[PDB]
Design a protein around this nucleic acid. Sequence first.
RNA 1: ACUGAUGCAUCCAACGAGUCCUUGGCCGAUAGGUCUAGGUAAUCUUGUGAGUAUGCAUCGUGAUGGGGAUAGAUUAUUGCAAUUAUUAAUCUUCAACGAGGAAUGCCUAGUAGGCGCAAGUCAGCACGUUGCGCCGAUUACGUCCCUGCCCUUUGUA
Lengths: 71, 51, 115, 103, 135, 151, 187
Amino acid sequence: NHSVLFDKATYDKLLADIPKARLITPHTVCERLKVNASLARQAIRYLKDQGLIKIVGEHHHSQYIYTRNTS
Amino acid sequence: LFNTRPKKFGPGSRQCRVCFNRHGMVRKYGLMMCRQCFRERANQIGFVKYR
Amino acid sequence: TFSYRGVELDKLLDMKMEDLLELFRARQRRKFQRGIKRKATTLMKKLRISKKNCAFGEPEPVNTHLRDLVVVPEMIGSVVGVYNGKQFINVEIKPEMVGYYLGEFSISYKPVRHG
Amino acid sequence: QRLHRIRITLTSKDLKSIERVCTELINGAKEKNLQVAGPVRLPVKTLRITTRKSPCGEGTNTWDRFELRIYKRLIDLHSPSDVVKQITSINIDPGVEVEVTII
Amino acid sequence: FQHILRILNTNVDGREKVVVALTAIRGIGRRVSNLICKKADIDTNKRAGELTADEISKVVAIASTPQQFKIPTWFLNRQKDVKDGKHKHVVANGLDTVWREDLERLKKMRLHRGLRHYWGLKVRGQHTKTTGRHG
Amino acid sequence: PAYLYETPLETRVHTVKDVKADAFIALYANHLKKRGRFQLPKWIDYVKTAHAKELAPYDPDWLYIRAAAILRHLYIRPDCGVGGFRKVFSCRQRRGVRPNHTSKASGKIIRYILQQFEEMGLVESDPEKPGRRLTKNGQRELDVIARQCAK
Amino acid sequence: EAKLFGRWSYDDVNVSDLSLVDYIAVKACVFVPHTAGRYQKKRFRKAMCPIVERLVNSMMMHGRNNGKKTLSVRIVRHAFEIIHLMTDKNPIQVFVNAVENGGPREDSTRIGSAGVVRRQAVDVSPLRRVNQAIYLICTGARLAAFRNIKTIAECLADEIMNCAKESSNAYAIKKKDEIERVAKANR
RNA sequence: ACUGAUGCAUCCAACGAGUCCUUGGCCGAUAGGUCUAGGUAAUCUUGUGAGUAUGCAUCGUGAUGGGGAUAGAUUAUUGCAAUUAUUAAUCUUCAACGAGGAAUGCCUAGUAGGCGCAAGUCAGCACGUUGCGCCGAUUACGUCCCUGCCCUUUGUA
């Protein structure tokens, strides 16, 4: 069902798209988007390093669970 | 020539001293006792069952 | 043409069996190093001299019990009557058959046909 | 004579057979008043066989749980070997394997 | 971007990672496909939908002749060929034709093992009273 | 609500046991590259690390982290050898349709890394005494980088 | 003191409604849901445990997932974090209000007056309504994420919030009204 | 299958059992081999660094990397002999099966279930049995409805 590459049309949107949402998970990326969970991990890892968003808890190795930054 | 294979190992090698039976051979601690033979004489050896 | 391996059938008889074993699977080598005594060693004579007895034009059936003997490119083009269980059956061993055991070729039992 | 060290092994099937020997040989040492330490009780090596009760397969598959028990116990001494031979040779017990050892 | 693919006369799929995409080729699997990817210098992070012309050309050379790139022989499928007598790697529809040769060899030879293929029973000596029943 | 609790005093950073064992290996693996000494095998393309494992390791620095882990493990238990280190990196093999069992680790790769530490001379025999042990220079190599990682 | 995971305080908050009160075990309380202790010798030691312990305890199913309490601690520790994320207040007050509304009110027992297997209307006890609540919470969350690539923690967090709510999307709040469908008729 | 599979790292058991059990050093991807070496055993193997577990990564709901049957080819091991393949490895080959129809079994606290280990038969072979620990729940504390049982009064050809 799902798209595997970035899709560089939606990369310009994806800067705007994810910081709107209240829940930020593996699932909420492919909720808004229609791509496999794997991109979502490297997306929210990219949005840690470059972008805004922050960890709810320091970390875990299975369920990530970020918030919007609120700034 | 006749009347001997290599008879060194396996159940054909060895038999119960008391009844000459290979089957059910208890070889723990070097008993060489067929089980039918072993259970009835077990008290006389030393073995007393509890729990 | 089309002997058995990269080494052709002209050369193989010439090649020594001892160094020959290197070009073998896994059990033939194990069997050969352990091997052989008794009445396999008589068939190395007996199946060899079975070739000369016929006048020409390419044999006569030498009966055996040894299913466990592995065939060897010394003795190819011979014949071996291998034991099933009651009856002997004829096996003209070929250039292709080297590697395998004798009692693989002669079956023990009839396959099926229920009802 | 010379300063020696002796540590005598005791083994049997019964508890009651050794508890004679442990009480007797320490009092036998205390005739001469040698340097005795008390009897060091090692862990019990329980042997085990489980056979089926029935001769043949019939009925429910029931099992015996047979057991031996073996009791290693060690009387310690510091004394020469000529002295100890009087103590051990008198008061030998029925069916108790005993072996004297220097060091 | 390229959806769908074909390497060595067998259809490799996109939407799959490059190591696992190569197992869709017959006569390739998981551990050897890593050695193909490592010695072709392909990034395993990349996706099999991409694959540039440099990447596929190296894989066909390694799949044809893996003895050249120091794969030490126990990795190969048909190890010692039993015809020309060398360490050989069988890939794709070669493996179909090799299986047709090796079974029909044993039918002409008339082994017990060959007759099991001829009748289509279990070969390896398994208790077929109850098991492998339905057919 | 932030996380509660400490120990009574702020914990001393001196020896290697005070360092968390995974975070030690993260540093000292990178130390093996940047120093240069240790040296590569030929076989690195193959392996997988065990008879039991059905696949090769993903990370290309699987050898350095293993040589990092084994060197600190000499400090935990002083006396050990090759059959010892086969047990410590044991794992669940999957037999097939059958139930699961234990299995021992690879003996080539675990022996080789010790011989490379012997060439520098951090871990050594012990020719008469059964089992390898770390030397004086082995400890100061460990304990200097224990203070660095927490810092 | 006493806080769950150290990020929450047992102190404060309150039971939602009369009944199912005192049956619940809050008030004092233990950081970490887990406790290995003897709770099954008497027949009302079962409502001495705090219900967060009874959630993690009953969250292990079926044969494959049983045991591994340490694993069920993690996914509940994530679930209480997500509950906090939406409609933030207290994970426990939302969880206590969920298990209030979760379990069924009435039930059909078989009393025939000899011969027949005939149904009859019977109200449910306060203990069983807590027993059924935590069971029905989980079996929604497990079934929701069984084939879907959604973490169980996500299902649990979602299931708990829904139960507090009257959405009825939940498996639990449906299976309340599915029993109360037939329990109305058996009057 | 995602409370998961896979690759790395972390660190914890008890019952045994040996005149065969196996540490230590070299060779080998692996299995295994080779040269020394302790042990009649609370001393040596062994504190048997067991696996569910924990931490950090990749995979993404696809019968897919879940599943490992079926099948070819090779390398060692036990034996006097392994073919109808004794096993153990290395590469491939990649089916059925998406929680199981009617029927029906086992079980009340360190118990169920899961996860290993050891012993018995044994030259070699456990998917079996007998013991051993580890992780550790849900739900009853009642009843005679089903299926049987025990004791009375009662009827019987």
